Amino acid sequence: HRVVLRLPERKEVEVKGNRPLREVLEELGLNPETVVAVRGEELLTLEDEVREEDTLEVLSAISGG
Amino acid sequence: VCKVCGQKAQVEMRSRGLALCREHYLDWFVKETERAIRRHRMLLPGERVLVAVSGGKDSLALWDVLSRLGYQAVGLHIELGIGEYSKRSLEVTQAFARERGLELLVVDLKEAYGFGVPELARLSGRVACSACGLSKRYIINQVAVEEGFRVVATGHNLDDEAAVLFGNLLNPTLSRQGPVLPEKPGLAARVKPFYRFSEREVLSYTLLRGIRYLHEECPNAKGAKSLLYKEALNLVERSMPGAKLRFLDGFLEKIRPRLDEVALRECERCGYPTTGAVCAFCRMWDAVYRRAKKRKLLPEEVSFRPRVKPL
Numbered sequence: 001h002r003v004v005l006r007l008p009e010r011k012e013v014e015v016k017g018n019r020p021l022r023e024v025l026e027e028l029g030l031n032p033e034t035v036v037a038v039r040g041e042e043l044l045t046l047e048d049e050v051r052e053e054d055t056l057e058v059l060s061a062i063s064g065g
Numbered sequence: 066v067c068k069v070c071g072q073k074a075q076v077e078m079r080s081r082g083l084a085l086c087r088e089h090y091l092d093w094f095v096k097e098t099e100r101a102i103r104r105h106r107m108l109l110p111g112e113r114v115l116v117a118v119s120g121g122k123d124s125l126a127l128w129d130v131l132s133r134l135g136y137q138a139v140g141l142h143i144e145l146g147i148g149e150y151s152k153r154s155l156e157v158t159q160a161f162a163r164e165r166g167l168e169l170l171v172v173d174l175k176e177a178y179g180f181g182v183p184e185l186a187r188l189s190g191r192v193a194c195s196a197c198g199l200s201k202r203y204i205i206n207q208v209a210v211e212e213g214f215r216v217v218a219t220g221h222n223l224d225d226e227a228a229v230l231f232g233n234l235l236n237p238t239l240s241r242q243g244p245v246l247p248e249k250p251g252l253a254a255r256v257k258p259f260y261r262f263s264e265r266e267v268l269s270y271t272l273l274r275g276i277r278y279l280h281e282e283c284p285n286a287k288g289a290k291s292l293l294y295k296e297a298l299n300l301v302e303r304s305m306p307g308a309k310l311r312f313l314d315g316f317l318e319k320i321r322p323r324l325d326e327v328a329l330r331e332c333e334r335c336g337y338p339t340t341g342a343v344c345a346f347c348r349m350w351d352a353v354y355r356r357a358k359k360r361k362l363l364p365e366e367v368s369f370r371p372r373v374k375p376l
C-alpha cells in the first residue's frame with residue numbers, strides 16, 4: 001500500500017493491494033531485473049502477494065558507477 | 066519455492082533456472098564466488114588480497130565473502146572528496162570494518178594531493194568521472210604495490226562488465242576487458258570475483274546478510290552512459306533471462322581471444338607503469354597544480370612530489 005522508493009533522494013507513493021508484486025512494479029514502470037522489493041526483513045519475489053496493509057521498500061539494484 | 070529445501074523462496078533467478086530461500090541463497094552465493102575464483106584462478110588460498118571498498122553494496126558484499134572464504138582481505142577506501150556522498154561512503158565503510166574487526170586502509174584524496182574529484186573536474190582539464198577513474202585506479206594500485214599485495218579485488222558485477230562491453234561495441238578498448246588481469250612489474254593483479262553476478266543478485270545477498278551499505282548514488286552518476294547501456298541490456302534481460310551472461314561469456318570466450326605488443330614503460334616521476342614518458346596520474350596533477358597556481362588556489366613555490374615506486 002505504502003511504497004518507499006530508492007534512492008533517497010527520497011520518494012514515496014502509494015498503490016492498491018491484494019495483487020502480485022509483478023503487477024505493482026509494472027504500474028510503477030519498474031524493471032524487476034533492476035530492483036529488489038523488501039517487506040520487513042523479507043525479500044519479495046514477483047509471485048509474492050502484497051497486501052492492502054503492506055509497507056514495502058523498493059531498492060534500486062542499479063549502480064550509477 | 067527453494068530448489069534445495071522446498072520452502073518459500075527469497076530470491077528467484079529465472080536466468081539460472083534457480084530459486085532459493087534465505088539460508089540457501091547465502092550458501093549458494095558464497096559458493097558461486099568460490100567457484101568463480103577457482104575457475105579463473107583469481108586468488109591463492111588464504112592469500113593477502115587488497116579489496117577496493119567504496120561502501121556500496123557490491124564491494125562490501127565482496128569484502129564479506131572474501132573474508133568468509135578464508136582469504137586475508139584488507140580493505141582500501143579512497144575518500145574522493147565528493148560532498149556528503151564521500152563522507153558517508155567513508156563512514157559506512159569504517160563502520161563495516163569496525164563491526165567485523167577488519168583492517169581498513171584509507172587514502173584521502175584532498176588531504177594527500179590537495180584537491181578532490183570536484184576540484185579535479187575544474188582544474189584538471191578532465192570531466193569528474195574521468196579524473197576520478199584515473200585517481201582510483203592509480204591509488205589502488207599504488208597502495209597494493211607499497212603494501213606488498215599481489216592482487217587487488219574490485220566489486221564489479223555482471224551489469225557493470227556487460228555495460229562496459231556494450232559501450233565499447235557502440236563506440237569502437239575491447240581486448241583489455243577481463244575478469245582477471247595479470248600482475249606485472251609495478252602493477253598488482255586485478256580480479257573481479259563478482260563479474261558473473263547480476264546487480265540484483267549481489268544486492269539480494271547484501272540485504273539477506275544484513276550488511277549496512279550506502280544506498281545513495283554519487284551525484285555525478287546521473288545521466289551517465291553506463292546507465293543507458295545497463296537500461297538497454299536489462300530491457301533485453303527482462304524478456305530473455307540469461308542474456309547478459311551469455312553476452313559477456315560469449316565475448317570473453319569467443320571474440321576477445323581473436324582480437325589481438327609493446328612493453329610497459331616506467332614513469333619518469335613516480336616509476337609506476339605507463340605507456341607514456343610521464344603517466345596519466347602525474348600529468349594530471351602537474352596540470353592541476355599549474356592551473357591552481359594561476360587561480361591562486363595553490364602557492365606558486367609548492368611542487369607536486371609523487372611517492373616513487375619502491376624496489
Ligand SMILES: Nc1ncnc2c1ncn2[C@@H]1O[C@H](COP(=O)(O)OP(=O)(O)OP(=O)(O)O)[C@@H](O)[C@H]1O
Pocket residue numbers: 063064065116117118119120121122123124125141142143144145154201218219220221225
Ligand atoms: N571510493 C572508493 N574507494 C575504494 N574503492 C572503490 C571506490 N569506489 C569504487 N571502488 C571500487 O571500484 C568498484 C566499482 O565502483 P563503482 O563506482 O562502479 O560502484 P560503487 O559506487 O563502488 O558501488 P559498489 O561498491 O556497489 O560497486 C567498486 O566495486 C569498488 O571495488
Ligand code: SF4
Pocket residue numbers: 064065147182193194195197198283284285286
Ligand atoms: S560517478 Fe562514479 S566516477 Fe563519476 S565521479 Fe561519482 S564516483 Fe567518480
Ligand SMILES: [Zn+2]
Pocket residue numbers: 067068069070071072085086087088089
Ligand atoms: Zn532453502
Ligand SMILES: [Zn+2]
Pocket residue numbers: 332333334335336337343344345346347348371
Ligand atoms: Zn607517474
